[PDB]
Design an enzyme around this catalytic site. Structure first.
Site, PDB file in Angstrom:
ATOM      1  N   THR A   1       0.823  -1.204   0.000  1.00  0.00           N
ATOM      2  CA  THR A   1       0.000   0.000   0.000  1.00  0.00           C
ATOM      3  C   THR A   1       0.860   1.257   0.000  1.00  0.00           C
ATOM      4  O   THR A   1       2.065   1.195   0.236  1.00  0.00           O
ATOM      5  CB  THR A   1      -0.936   0.045   1.218  1.00  0.00           C
ATOM      6  OG1 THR A   1      -1.516   1.351   1.325  1.00  0.00           O
ATOM      7  CG2 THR A   1      -0.164  -0.266   2.489  1.00  0.00           C
TER       8      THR A   1
ATOM      9  N   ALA B   1      -5.870  -5.696   5.672  1.00  0.00           N
ATOM     10  CA  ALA B   1      -6.990  -4.987   5.061  1.00  0.00           C
ATOM     11  C   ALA B   1      -8.267  -5.161   5.871  1.00  0.00           C
ATOM     12  O   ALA B   1      -8.974  -4.186   6.147  1.00  0.00           O
ATOM     13  CB  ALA B   1      -7.197  -5.470   3.627  1.00  0.00           C
TER      14      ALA B   1
END
Lengths: 201, 240, 239, 199, 204, 238, 248, 220, 232
Positions: free
Chosen positions: A1, A49
């Site tokens: 990310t 996540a």
């Protein structure tokens, strides 16, 4: 990310890629990193996540309860501290978290970074994830506190594309949000390839 | 006061009765009437919906607990609702662990075990709700009436609640057709039963009746004013 | 009958134990608090210590947090217990959210504590009414009254304890928008309301003023004589 | 790691700290505050494992303010030091230990100034001097050979300047700016930082 | 190596109608040196003193809970605690956490309150009580002080001779180890005076 | 001799009645009049303030509150009892928006609140809960997948879908008037006009801005409580 | 009526069980303390010494709590012992946690909170014991606090509790010159108060229980007056009374 | 560490060492290992010294309570049953090797509980690190149904072989003799090795040590 | 006053708990028992007289030791006395385990007083209908205490409770002197038993225990018979 969120005189932006991977194979390229938890408060994404989605949805429930009980909107500092404490009691048995608490309240546009390790740190420039250093370099080269809205947008898109381009664990789409006194706004979502064409020349 | 023997369930009368249990039994006599009938392969629960005022909806008296088993309440809303959540939880637990529907007899046995504890032990008030249980299992339809005395009976039919003796004597007049009737016939028999319960000035309107039917292949489905319309179109006129 | 049971409704729908605890406040002492434009004031009647009591430990007015204060009417042990619990909760709230406790939050906590103390047998209700005062983060003047029934309410200027009805009517007849224009006007109103019931003046009155985050200092017994000189001066001035 | 220089004068303590916040690769915040205001006459410096540091510091901070508000007077700095030591020792053997080092420095009207040291095990220590972090080994020699029991305020700032510039020269990473405070009869006050050109 | 994490050095001595207790002053982590005011010797009374060896914070915790429970006992009874009760008390305080042991090996010394007969005792990490008629040491320097107090001690040793013997023993024993050293505090207590001193040894 | 059965909720009358619950029911009439009406365009909630003193802060006295942006509430009974009820309702609505991430229907809202209710005589109160029946009657209104919906909750735990229900001191008279003043095709504006008409006919004092709190919920907008200017606008017509 | 368990409220608001716990102290032995300029003392009555009590004790009505804390008791013996033990536990818990002797006000408030909790809830009879704590603290020097079975407390410079307490305290306040008594004059005043409040023409030192608290040389010493000392003091006050009457 | 136990014609004789070692360095030379439980029963411990001490006081207190409630002298089976139950409660987490021997109305008895918590009745048994030498003597020179004085020197030479074949035992010998009319707690029974004489005075006279500061506090 | 003589957690408007007073009245109706503290030791005795000689007198003992130097006697209920003995033994042995030193009798009396007043804390549990006499020797001093159903504990040079306790107390205060010897103390105790024994004490009709520097020991029937003959 890769998430970048820097504060300036006009407000705060946020950056987000969309690439989700399980090791090598890319699990998904259509991941919404920054979470629209509250119409005036924004939450970011890093680490696990589902951990992030669950914790931010818990925080969303908590701030809705707070605004319905106290009949006043929750402070960004209060929300960041609430996140820090509610994840702290979970520290040590397998939590993976890094998150920015971004929003504008009565004490000006606020931004704090919370993480599984335990820092709940404020500050102007926040970059976490795989390409955090790549975004940090371009932002600190280009950070000025006086970025006007259109030029802030331009430099925002510049730095966010630099971040999503220099990293190998990043890709897919781009998520960009801006915070103002009436809440947050979805500014734009430019893909890696189209924005590659725009920023090649 | 010689009735100091009815202040808690844990004391006996000098004549060997638990007057609190008897008061709980009489409590369900207050609620509206409800009668159930069962065929060779189909069991019906028909109840008389009641409303606090005509400007508000009628109080639901037929409750769905599982696709094959259904209940009808007459008495306290709180106790009946609690029994309903308990029923739903147990039916789900049976479906989860055994993958088979809860037997009607077994369900009513666990109902009796659950509701006996308030009757026996100080604390919880006795469950003062009259429950009509209609379901389907291996040997076909069953109608179980669980009296608030923590007792239950396997009945061909039962009417429990206000002025339910009229429906009781109606069914006492009309056994001879219950076993061999189809859906429409048993439904009209039940409707005539409630009409016997209902006085002259009132009639079984669409908003007034609630019908629940279960069977071998047909799940426990509850009908409403628009849904009871085809079933009441075959209904005859009141013999007044 | 229906009176000696905290959790039994009367036939006319009253929890008589709760109302008796509420009435127990009326046997306390007068405590009036007014909120101004930038100030909030607390006027309480002080029991004249006979000859030996140490006035340092007879605290009627206490501050829950640096941003909230409170005066109480009722049994002193109950007030002390609720003070300890409420300031502990203020500190724990700052632990959880890091920002100063708003008056609404602490008043809600006090009301909920009293309520959970008046909904079961074996737990006597807190027979105290407390006037909560303080400023929020944005410095808005808010004042709250908490009732032993477990409820709270927002009051611009309220009085509790004995003679609270007379002070209430006095404030109704005298509370004006211009009466809170300056700190001195709010003070004049609060001392006037106090001397309505405690007519002796001089001693037997304690005052506390909270301005916009000054960490209120109770008015010390040097300018209470000065402030009552001002009060008497204005009093002979309009008459 | 992050630095905490506290030096005790004849009637004062000069406590110093950096202002850098980093997460294992880079400094996120350039104006971090690792020093907490225990009360008007006492302040706490806690370092070590991050995250634990901040919530533990505010927990102790709100405990001490709860004390000063429920009793109307604040603790003596020695009492506060022993309180923090007891808390962290009690939480030490527990299933969630707090592996955070700490410093504690304040003043008292009855006796005078005080300064206290805590490891991540939290054993107490009172000295006219204190240091924490990986630079403590570097500037302990300066701390010893450059100290007298009569440090004056201007010479105090000069001595902390010497220690600070030795950190800037020697310590591996970058410490741009530093918070230093005076504690005396008038309470807590904030002083300035240092910077060094490289052009 | 838990003992080496902070270290320490304590010794207890008795003579003719007097007692002498000595302890190290160093405080430091397993590798680095920090302070020199650590308190390993603690007053459990006017003539009762306890020396502690173990983890620094474990030492302080056991000392504080001991002081709490000892003041409780003194208030309950109203009498001075006779040192054998103190040794059993400290043994219980350590042992009551056998499955969570405090890695601390303390020591006590004192005199009988009535006949003024000096008494010393030794305790183990998990709390094995032990008493000697001559001497006892604890800390990181156990071997050296043990050997040279075996080679140096004599029974029925006069008070001034007691102070000289304890001083020489502790100094020449601490000259043989590094983690414990750099200043030693010596406390001699007699039924008439309590002379609190600190012998001048090397600062190294 | 009723007196042996009013003492305690776990007693049964010879007529099988719950006298404690009946007393709790009658305790609703101690509260101020609340009127809610259901129309195709939405639901509006009208209540009486019963202000004790002009120095009162009207924002403090709460007769109508928000459980969620899509739903509305009205109260009649004890302030603290309803405070716990409303807090539980809000916690439940966020529980649903957590578990299913959807807006939970008003019938299920009253279901969950009634689940908190009717729990007075339940052994799960060992941690601590009501040993006495909850003493407030609840009026729930809002818009869900079934359009505008209004539900009235009974302190016993019973709920009923009502087109127009009145609770409080004048529940009987206001209900009697609503019986003939209600029509199925009533518009939101004319419904609110009729509601204030009933309040005027029912309330003990004159209708001013500080005598009525007004609320509305429509499919279009979220829960809106009428402001001072909106209240003046809606009251100047009447 | 409303004389049932303490968790009840009379319609006028009075807590009748707490009221009876109040008036019950009037059946307890008389004990007082006063605050001198540089000293504080506790005087108590030994109401029960029939003939054969061993007196194997340091003090009966006066109970020491800490190197700095001491109190006098007045109430049921069982609740007295429980209260003293809890006082010791709380004081030493504070000492262990904070490494400082507990302030007198803090310990007093701790006891008051426990006593209130014993009447606030639980259906337990409140501690029918009224205490007179005496002690020193660096925050306010010498302080004396008068407890209360209700759970309240007060800081006093002169207070008597026990039988005949009203008359004793009335005359005590009649004859108190604040800020200008040493230990000797305070002792004389306490002895005179005992003379006036006890049911004896000549009170014996055996019936009298005096403990004095004084800070000197950096330490606070709590001592009960020895039999020689108490007899000397009572004989001095006796010849002083003789002097007063012969002058009269 | 050495613990030994035999049954002779009339009662029990127990032999224990006095050397206590922590790590590889001896801690004390005259520790007491014969533990008082009852005026008619006695135990010897080995392994973790603190565990042995605390378990012995616990069982002695419980058994004293038992005897006082009964009024009769406690029996060996009772003591060993509680001892083994509590030892097995901790399931070897306590390193306590104890041997239990005594006299009851049924006669002399002698049991041996290993640290894990198993026991057996033996006419002759020893445990410890030096158990090898003691049990070798136990098979070499021991005779059953054998008189009191010959029991004494038997146990003495057995423990002597233990001390002279093991490092972890010696410097004293203490014996406990149990009989229906005799309890002989010999302590020390016979010292096997006294410390050698010191040939040189190290001359520790006055003035040999310097001091920093003085502080005088009188008392009493 | 009657509505308050029914629970242990309600204060009478005038005085105190009435159930405690009723427990004391139960105590005063028990078997007479006298304890005397001499200069060098203590003696406590009681009467074991009961009808139906079929009863085995050796089966139960009213005088029991708590430790090697602490003994106790009671007056009132029997089973409550046994329970008190059990709790006292447990408490004393806990003190021994914690401190490895014989329990001082003052602390034993304090702890047993606390445990019995514990039964007085709340309703639903009646207070012990038994008063305790504690004899002990320590620090060169013989201690004699009385423990109350109310949890009160006090010292006694020589006392006597149970049936006809007022007459026994008058006898003791008209007999006892501070310089009394142990044997003369036993003589005075047996005489106190006698003056209200009502039926010619035998060797087994009474039960006497003695404590001194050599610990506490209940006197055997032979010594009891010898002392009874000596007094005659």
């Amino acid at each position: 990310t890769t998430t970048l969120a820097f504060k300036f005189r006009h407000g705060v932006i946020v950056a987000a890629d969309s690439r989700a991977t399980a090791g090598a194979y890319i699990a998904s390229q259509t991941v919404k990193k920054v979470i629209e938890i509250n119409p005036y408060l924004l939450g970011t994404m890093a680490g696990g996540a589902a951990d992030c989605s669950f914790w931010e949805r818990l925080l969303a429930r908590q701030c809705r309860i707070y605004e319905l009980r106290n009949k006043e909107r929750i402070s960004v500092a209060a929300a960041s501290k609430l996140l820090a404490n509610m994840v702290y009691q979970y520290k040590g048995m397998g939590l993976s978290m890094g998150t920015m608490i971004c929003g504008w309240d009565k004490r000006g546009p606020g931004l704090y970074y919370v993480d599984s390790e335990g820092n709940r740190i404020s500050g102007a420039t926040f970059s976490v994830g795989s390409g955090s250093v790549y975004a940090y370099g371009v932002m600190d080269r280009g950070y000025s506190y006086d970025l006007e809205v259109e030029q802030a947008y331009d430099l925002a898109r510049r730095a966010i594309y630099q971040a999503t381009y220099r990293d190998a664990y990043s890709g897919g789409a781009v998520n960009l949000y801006h915070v103002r006194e009436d809440g947050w706004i979805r500014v734009s979502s430019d893909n890696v390839a189209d924005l590659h064409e725009k920023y090649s020349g | 006061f010689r009735n100091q023997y009815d202040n808690d369930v844990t004391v006996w009368s000098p004549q060997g009765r638990i007057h609190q249990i008897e008061y709980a039994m009489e409590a369900v006599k207050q609620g509206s009437a409800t009668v159930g009938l069962k065929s060779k392969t189909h069991a019906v629960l028909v109840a008389l919906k009641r409303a606090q005022s005509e400007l508000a909806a009628h109080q639901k008296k037929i409750l769905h607990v599982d696709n094959h088993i259904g209940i009808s309440i007459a008495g306290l809303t709180a106790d009946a609702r609690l029994l309903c959540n308990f029923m739903r939880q147990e039916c789900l637990d049976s479906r989860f662990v055994f993958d088979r529907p809860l037997p009607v007899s077994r369900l009513v046995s666990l109902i009796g075990s659950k509701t006996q504890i308030p009757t026996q032990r100080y604390g919880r008030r006795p469950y003062g709700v009259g429950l009509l249980i209609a379901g389907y299992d291996d040997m076909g339809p069953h109608i179980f009436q669980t009296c608030p005395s923590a007792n239950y009976f396997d009945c061909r039919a039962m009417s429990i609640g206000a002025r339910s003796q009229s429906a009781r004597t109606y069914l006492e007049r009309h056994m001879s057709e219950f076993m061999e009737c189809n859906l429409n016939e048993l439904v009209k028999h039940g409707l005539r039963a409630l009409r016997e319960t209902l006085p002259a000035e009132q009639d079984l309107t669409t908003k007034n009746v609630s019908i629940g039917i279960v069977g071998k292949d047909l799940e426990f489905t509850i009908y409403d004013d628009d849904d009871v319309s085809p079933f009441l179109e075959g209904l005859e006129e009141r013999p007044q | 009958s229906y009176d000696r049971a905290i959790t039994v409704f009367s036939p006319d729908g009253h929890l008589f134990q709760v109302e008796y605890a509420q009435e127990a406040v009326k046997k306390g002492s007068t405590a009036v608090g007014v909120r101004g434009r930038d100030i909030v004031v607390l006027g309480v009647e002080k029991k004249s210590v006979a000859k030996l009591q140490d006035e340092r430990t007879v605290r009627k007015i206490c501050a829950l947090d640096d941003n909230v204060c409170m005066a109480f009417a009722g049994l002193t042990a109950d007030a002390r217990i609720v003070i300890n619990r409420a300031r502990v909760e203020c500190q724990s709230h700052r632990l959880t959210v890091e920002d100063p406790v708003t008056v609404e939050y602490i008043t809600r906590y006090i009301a909920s504590l009293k309520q959970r103390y008046t909904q079961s047998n074996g737990r006597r209700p807190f027979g105290i009414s407390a006037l909560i005062v303080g400023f929020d983060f944005d410095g808005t003047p808010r004042l709250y009254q908490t009732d032993p029934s477990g409820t709270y309410h927002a009051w611009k200027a309220n009085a509790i304890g004995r003679g609270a009805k007379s002070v209430r009517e006095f404030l109704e007849k005298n509370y004006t928008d211009e009466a809170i224009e300056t700190d001195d006007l709010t003070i004049k109103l609060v001392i006037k309301a106090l001397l309505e019931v405690v007519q002796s003046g001089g001693k037997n009155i304690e005052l506390a003023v909270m301005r916009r985050d000054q960490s209120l200092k109770i008015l010390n017994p040097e300018e209470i004589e000065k402030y009552v000189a001002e009060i008497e001066k204005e009093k002979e001035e309009n008459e | 790691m992050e630095y905490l220089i506290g030096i005790q004068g004849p009637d004062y303590v000069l406590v110093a700290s950096d202002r850098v916040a980093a997460s294992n690769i880079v400094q996120m915040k350039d104006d971090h505050d690792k020093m907490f205001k225990m009360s008007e006459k006492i302040l706490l410096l806690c370092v070590g494992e991050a995250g634990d540091t901040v919530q533990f510091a505010e927990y102790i901070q709100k405990n001490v303010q709860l004390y000063k508000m429920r009793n109307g007077y604040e603790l003596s700095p020695t009492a506060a030091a022993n309180f923090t030591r007891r808390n962290l020792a009690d939480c030490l053997r527990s299933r969630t230990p707090y592996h955070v080092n700490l410093l504690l420095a304040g003043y008292d009207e009855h006796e005078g100034p005080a300064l206290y040291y805590m490891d991540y095990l939290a054993a107490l220590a009172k000295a006219p001097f204190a240091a924490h972090g990986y630079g403590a080994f570097l500037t302990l020699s300066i701390l010893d050979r450059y100290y007298t029991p009569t440090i004056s305020r201007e010479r105090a700032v000069e001595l902390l300047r010497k220690c600070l510039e030795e950190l800037q020269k020697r310590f591996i990473l970058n410490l741009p700016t530093f918070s230093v405070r005076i504690i005396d009869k008038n309470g807590i006050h904030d002083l300035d930082n240092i910077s060094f050109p490289k052009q | 190596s838990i003992m080496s994490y902070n270290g320490g050095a304590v010794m207890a001595m008795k003579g003719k109608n007097c007692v002498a207790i000595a302890a190290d002053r160093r405080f430091g982590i397993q590798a680095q040196m920090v302070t020199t005011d650590f308190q390993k010797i603690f007053p459990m009374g006017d003539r009762l003193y306890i020396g502690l060896a173990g983890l620094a914070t474990d030492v302080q915790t056991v000392a504080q809970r001991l002081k709490f429970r000892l003041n409780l006992y003194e208030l309950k009874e109203g009498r001075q605690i006779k040192p054998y009760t103190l040794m059993s008390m400290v043994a219980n305080l350590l042992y009551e956490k056998r499955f969570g042991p405090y890695y601390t090996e303390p020591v006590i010394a004192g005199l009988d309150p009535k006949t003024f007969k000096p008494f010393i005792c030794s305790l183990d990490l998990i709390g094995c009580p032990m008493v000697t008629d001559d001497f006892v040491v604890s800390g990181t320097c156990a071997e050296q002080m043990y050997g040279m107090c075996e080679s140096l001690w004599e029974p029925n040793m006069d008070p001034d001779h007691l102070f000289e013997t304890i001083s020489q023993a502790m100094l020449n024993a601490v000259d043989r180890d590094a983690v414990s050293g750099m200043g030693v505090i010596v406390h001699i207590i007699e039924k008439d005076k309590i002379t609190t001193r600190t012998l001048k040894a090397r600062m190294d | 001799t009723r007196s042996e059965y009013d003492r305690g909720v776990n007693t049964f009358s010879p007529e099988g009645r719950l006298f404690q619950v009946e007393y709790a029911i009658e305790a609703i009439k101690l509260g101020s009049t609340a009127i809610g009406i259901q129309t195709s365009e939405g639901v509006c909630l009208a209540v009486e303030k019963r202000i004790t003193s002009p120095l009162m802060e009207p924002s403090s006295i709460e007769k109508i509150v928000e459980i969620d942006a899509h739903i509305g509430c009205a109260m009649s009974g004890l302030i603290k009892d309803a405070k716990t009820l409303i807090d539980k309702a809000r916690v439940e609505t966020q529980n649903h928006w957590f578990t299913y991430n959807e807006t939970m229907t008003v019938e299920s809202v009253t279901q969950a609140v009634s689940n908190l209710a009717l729990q007075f005589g339940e052994e799960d109160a060992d941690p601590g809960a009501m040993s006495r029946p909850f003493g407030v009657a609840l009026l729930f209104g809002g818009v869900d997948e079934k359009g505008p919906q209004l539900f009235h909750m009974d302190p016993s735990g019973t709920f009923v879908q009502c087109d127009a229900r009145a609770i409080g001191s004048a529940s009987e008279g206001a209900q009697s008037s609503l019986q003939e003043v209600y029509h199925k095709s009533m518009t939101l504006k004319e419904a609110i006009k009729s509601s204030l008409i009933i309040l005027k006919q029912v309330m003990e004092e004159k209708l001013n801005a500080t005598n009525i709190e007004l609320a509305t919920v429509q499919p279009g907008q979220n829960f809106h409580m009428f402001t001072k200017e909106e209240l003046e606008e809606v009251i100047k017509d009447i | 009526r409303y004389d049932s368990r303490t968790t009840i409220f009379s319609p006028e608001g009075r807590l009748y069980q707490v009221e009876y716990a109040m008036e019950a102290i009037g059946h307890a032995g008389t004990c007082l303390g006063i605050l001198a300029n540089d000293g504080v003392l506790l005087a108590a009555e030994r109401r029960n010494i029939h003939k054969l009590l061993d007196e194997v004790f340091f003090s009966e009505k006066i109970y020491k709590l800490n190197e700095d804390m001491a109190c006098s008791v007045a109430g049921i013996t069982s609740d007295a012992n429980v209260l003293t033990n809890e006082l010791r536990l709380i004081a030493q818990r504070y000492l262990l946690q904070y490494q400082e002797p507990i302030p007198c006000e803090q310990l007093v408030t701790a006891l008051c909170d426990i006593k209130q909790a014993y009447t606030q809830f639980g259906g337990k009879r409140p501690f029918g014991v009224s205490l007179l704590y005496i002690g020193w603290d660096k925050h306010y020097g010498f302080q004396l606090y008068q407890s209360d079975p209700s759970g309240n407390y007060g800081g006093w410079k002169a207070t008597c509790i026990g039988n005949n307490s009203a008359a004793a305290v009335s005359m005590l306040k009649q004859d108190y010159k604040e800020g200008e008594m040493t230990l000797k004059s305070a002792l004389a005043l306490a002895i005179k108060v005992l003379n006036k409040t006890m049911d004896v023409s000549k009170l014996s030192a055996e019936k009298v229980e005096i403990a004095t608290l004084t800070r000197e040389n950096g330490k606070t010493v709590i001592r009960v007056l020895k039999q020689k000392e108490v007899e000397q003091l009572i004989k001095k006050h006796e010849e002083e009374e003789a002097k007063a009457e012969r002058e009269k | 560490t050495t613990i030994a136990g035999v049954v002779y014609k009339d009662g029990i004789v127990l032999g224990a060492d006095t050397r206590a070692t922590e790590g590889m360095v001896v801690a004390d030379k005259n520790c007491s290992k014969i533990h008082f439980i009852s005026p008619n029963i006695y135990c010897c411990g080995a392994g973790t010294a603190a565990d042995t001490d605390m378990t012995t006081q616990l069982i002695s207190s419980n058994l004293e309570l038992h005897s006082l409630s009964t009024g009769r002298l406690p029996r060996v089976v009772t003591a060993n049953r509680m001892l083994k139950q509590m030892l097995f409660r901790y399931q070897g987490y306590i390193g306590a090797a104890l041997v239990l021997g005594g006299v009851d109305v049924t006669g002399p008895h002698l049991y041996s509980i290993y640290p894990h918590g198993s026991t057996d009745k033996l006419p002759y048994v020893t445990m410890g690190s030096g158990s090898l030498a003691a049990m070798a003597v136990f098979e070499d020179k021991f005779r059953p149904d054998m008189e009191e004085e010959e029991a004494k020197n038997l146990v003495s030479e057995a423990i002597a072989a233990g001390i002279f074949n093991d490092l972890g035992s010696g410097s004293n010998i203490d014996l406990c003799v149990i009989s229906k009319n005799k309890l002989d707690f010999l302590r020390p029974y016979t010292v096997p090795n006294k410390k050698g004489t010191r040939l040189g005075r190290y001359r520790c006279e006055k003035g040999t040590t310097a001091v920093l500061t003085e502080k005088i506090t009188p008392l009493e | 006053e009657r509505g308050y003589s029914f629970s242990l957690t309600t204060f009478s408007p005038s005085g105190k708990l009435v159930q405690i007073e009723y427990a004391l009245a139960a105590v005063a109706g028990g078997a007479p028992s006298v304890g005397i503290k001499a200069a060098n030791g203590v003696v406590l005795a009681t009467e074991k007289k009961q009808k139906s000689i079929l009863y085995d007198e050796r089966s139960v003992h009213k005088v029991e030791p708590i430790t090697k130097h602490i003994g106790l006697v009671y007056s009132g209920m029997g089973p409550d006395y046994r329970v008190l003995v059990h709790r006292a033994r447990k408490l004393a042995q806990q003190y021994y385990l914690v401190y490895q030193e014989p329990i001082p009798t003052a602390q034993l009396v304090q702890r047993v007083a606390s445990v019995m007043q514990e039964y007085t804390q709340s309703g639903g549990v009646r207070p012990f209908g038994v008063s305790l006499l504690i004899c002990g020797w320590n620090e060169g001093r013989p201690y004699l205490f009385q423990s109350d159903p109310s949890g009160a504990y006090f010292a006694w040079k020589a006392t006597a409770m149970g049936k006809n306790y007022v007459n026994g107390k008058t006898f003791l205060e008209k007999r006892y002197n501070e310089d009394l010897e142990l044997e003369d103390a036993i003589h005075t105790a047996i005489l106190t038993l006698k003056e209200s024994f009502e039926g010619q004490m035998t060797e087994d009709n009474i039960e006497v225990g003695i404590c001194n520097e050599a610990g506490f020991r209940r006197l055997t029937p032979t010594e009891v018979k010898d002392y009874l003959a000596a007094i005659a």
